[PDB]
Design an enzyme around this catalytic site. Structure first.
Site, mmCIF file in Angstrom:
data_model
loop_
_atom_site.group_PDB
_atom_site.id
_atom_site.type_symbol
_atom_site.label_atom_id
_atom_site.label_comp_id
_atom_site.label_asym_id
_atom_site.label_seq_id
_atom_site.Cartn_x
_atom_site.Cartn_y
_atom_site.Cartn_z
ATOM 1 N N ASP B 25 -9.116 14.092 21.558
ATOM 2 C CA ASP B 25 -10.253 14.130 20.676
ATOM 3 C C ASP B 25 -11.021 12.830 20.613
ATOM 4 O O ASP B 25 -10.653 11.922 19.870
ATOM 5 C CB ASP B 25 -9.747 14.513 19.286
ATOM 6 C CG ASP B 25 -10.856 14.909 18.334
ATOM 7 O OD1 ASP B 25 -12.041 14.651 18.626
ATOM 8 O OD2 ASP B 25 -10.533 15.479 17.277
ATOM 9 N N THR B 26 -12.142 12.774 21.331
ATOM 10 C CA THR B 26 -12.977 11.577 21.329
ATOM 11 C C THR B 26 -13.670 11.357 19.960
ATOM 12 O O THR B 26 -14.203 10.281 19.706
ATOM 13 C CB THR B 26 -14.023 11.629 22.453
ATOM 14 O OG1 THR B 26 -14.836 12.800 22.295
ATOM 15 C CG2 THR B 26 -13.336 11.670 23.807
ATOM 16 N N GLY B 27 -13.695 12.390 19.113
ATOM 17 C CA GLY B 27 -14.293 12.285 17.783
ATOM 18 C C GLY B 27 -13.279 11.892 16.712
ATOM 19 O O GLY B 27 -13.558 11.926 15.514
HETATM 20 C C1 LIG Z 1 -16.038 32.817 14.230
HETATM 21 C C2 LIG Z 1 -15.658 31.483 14.879
HETATM 22 C C3 LIG Z 1 -16.526 30.334 14.356
HETATM 23 C C4 LIG Z 1 -16.134 28.998 14.975
HETATM 24 C C5 LIG Z 1 -15.151 28.157 14.154
HETATM 25 N N1 LIG Z 1 -14.597 27.101 14.989
HETATM 26 C C6 LIG Z 1 -13.921 26.080 14.472
HETATM 27 O O1 LIG Z 1 -13.769 25.919 13.260
HETATM 28 C C7 LIG Z 1 -13.368 25.060 15.457
HETATM 29 C C8 LIG Z 1 -11.902 25.339 15.720
HETATM 30 N N2 LIG Z 1 -13.524 23.734 14.882
HETATM 31 C C9 LIG Z 1 -13.445 22.611 15.588
HETATM 32 O O2 LIG Z 1 -13.230 22.586 16.806
HETATM 33 C C10 LIG Z 1 -13.658 21.319 14.793
HETATM 34 C C11 LIG Z 1 -15.138 20.871 14.758
HETATM 35 C C12 LIG Z 1 -16.133 21.896 14.170
HETATM 36 C C13 LIG Z 1 -16.428 23.039 15.124
HETATM 37 O O3 LIG Z 1 -16.265 22.830 16.342
HETATM 38 O O4 LIG Z 1 -16.799 24.147 14.668
HETATM 39 N N3 LIG Z 1 -12.844 20.249 15.331
HETATM 40 C C14 LIG Z 1 -12.415 19.283 14.530
HETATM 41 O O5 LIG Z 1 -12.701 19.243 13.313
HETATM 42 C C15 LIG Z 1 -11.543 18.191 15.176
HETATM 43 C C16 LIG Z 1 -10.062 18.491 14.896
HETATM 44 C C17 LIG Z 1 -9.717 19.945 15.002
HETATM 45 C C18 LIG Z 1 -9.854 20.622 16.219
HETATM 46 C C19 LIG Z 1 -9.591 21.998 16.318
HETATM 47 C C20 LIG Z 1 -9.188 22.706 15.186
HETATM 48 C C21 LIG Z 1 -9.045 22.028 13.955
HETATM 49 C C22 LIG Z 1 -9.311 20.656 13.878
HETATM 50 N N4 LIG Z 1 -11.942 16.956 14.533
HETATM 51 C C23 LIG Z 1 -13.207 16.538 14.565
HETATM 52 C C24 LIG Z 1 -13.509 15.266 13.772
HETATM 53 C C25 LIG Z 1 -14.876 14.683 14.112
HETATM 54 C C26 LIG Z 1 -15.319 13.824 12.921
HETATM 55 C C27 LIG Z 1 -16.255 12.724 13.337
HETATM 56 C C28 LIG Z 1 -15.902 14.691 11.827
HETATM 57 N N5 LIG Z 1 -12.524 14.188 13.686
HETATM 58 C C29 LIG Z 1 -11.669 14.133 12.670
HETATM 59 O O6 LIG Z 1 -11.623 14.993 11.788
HETATM 60 C C30 LIG Z 1 -10.736 12.923 12.644
HETATM 61 N N6 LIG Z 1 -11.266 11.968 11.674
HETATM 62 C C31 LIG Z 1 -11.680 10.765 12.054
HETATM 63 O O7 LIG Z 1 -11.593 10.380 13.211
HETATM 64 C C32 LIG Z 1 -12.269 9.845 10.991
HETATM 65 N N7 LIG Z 1 -13.106 10.588 10.010
HETATM 66 C C33 LIG Z 1 -11.197 8.991 10.295
HETATM 67 C C34 LIG Z 1 -10.597 9.610 9.020
HETATM 68 C C35 LIG Z 1 -10.906 8.794 7.771
HETATM 69 N N8 LIG Z 1 -10.121 7.563 7.715
HETATM 70 C C36 LIG Z 1 -9.717 6.980 6.587
HETATM 71 N N9 LIG Z 1 -10.006 7.513 5.397
HETATM 72 N N10 LIG Z 1 -9.026 5.840 6.648
HETATM 73 C C37 LIG Z 1 -9.287 13.337 12.321
HETATM 74 C C38 LIG Z 1 -8.776 14.351 13.373
HETATM 75 C C39 LIG Z 1 -8.397 12.089 12.293
HETATM 76 C C40 LIG Z 1 -14.002 29.019 13.632
HETATM 77 N N11 LIG Z 1 -13.127 28.438 12.827
HETATM 78 O O8 LIG Z 1 -14.138 29.580 12.518
#
Ligand SMILES: CCCC[C@H](NC(=O)[C@H](C)NC(=O)[C@H](CCC(=O)O)NC(=O)[C@H](Cc1ccccc1)NC[C@H](CC(C)C)NC(=O)[C@@H](NC(=O)[C@@H](N)CCCNC(N)=[NH2+])C(C)C)C(N)=O
EC number: 3.4.23.16
Lengths: 99, 99
Positions: B25-27
């Site tokens: 995860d680059t994000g």
């Molecule tokens: C009908 C289908 C619709 C599509 C929908 N799809 C999703 O929800 C898919 C799985 N989501 C994702 O892929 C989402 C991004 C949103 C998106 O793509 O829609 N991905 C994500 O949210 C991934 C992790 C993840 C991956 C897969 C599943 C769950 C979680 N993280 C993305 C995110 C980017 C950030 C800049 C906001 N990074 C983070 O959340 C990271 N956070 C960070 O790097 C910093 N904020 C540091 C934290 C704060 N620090 C502190 N307080 N000291 C964390 C992993 C440490 C489905 N769910 O419902």
């Protein structure tokens, strides 16, 4: 170009004719942009992240320039902490992870 | 290797003597691994992303092998929906974004 990861991979994007900064996020399936006015019809969608689920407006076939590269696809607009360019558009610009 | 982004960039990692699948995860600034009984001390931390924040335990100098590449650094352990390898460790395996 080649982007190392010592700093957040932030890039300038152009969406709705407005420039913004976004993060290339290989961990995002989708592209989520902060609340803004965007030309086009949309549909309510719910997406999930690390802390839970949020409601977003799903805009399809949106033209967006990412670091000087054109992509046309789904852009979700909602209360995201930062603008993130997900895999749906990163694949469009030919981005790969390499090591 | 080169990893395209058509699919989630999942790789096999080894941490605390266990093999798991993790998302490059680059994000993600940090690395967060699903709840596991890792020994050693830690300090509470709260990390956020889409949807809010989750409480995690921060472990320093944890060794992780990412797709056969050794790395050592800070690993957060908590109720994450997926094992996430962030920039803190991706920089150690020489991972870049290319387009
Ligand atoms: C009908 C289908 C619709 C599509 C929908 N799809 C999703 O929800 C898919 C799985 N989501 C994702 O892929 C989402 C991004 C949103 C998106 O793509 O829609 N991905 C994500 O949210 C991934 C992790 C993840 C991956 C897969 C599943 C769950 C979680 N993280 C993305 C995110 C980017 C950030 C800049 C906001 N990074 C983070 O959340 C990271 N956070 C960070 O790097 C910093 N904020 C540091 C934290 C704060 N620090 C502190 N307080 N000291 C964390 C992993 C440490 C489905 N769910 O419902």
């Amino acid at each position: 170009p080649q982007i190392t990861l010592w700093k957040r991979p932030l890039v300038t994007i152009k969406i709705g004719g407005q420039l913004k900064e976004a993060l290339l996020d290989t961990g995002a399936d989708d592209t989520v942009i902060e609340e803004m006015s965007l030309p086009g019809r949309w549909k309510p969608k719910m997406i999930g992240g690390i802390g839970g689920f949020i409601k977003v407006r799903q805009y399809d076939q949106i033209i967006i320039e990412i670091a000087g590269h054109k992509a046309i696809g789904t852009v979700l607009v909602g209360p995201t902490p930062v603008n993130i360019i997900g895999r749906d558009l990163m694949t469009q610009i030919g981005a790969t992870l390499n090591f």
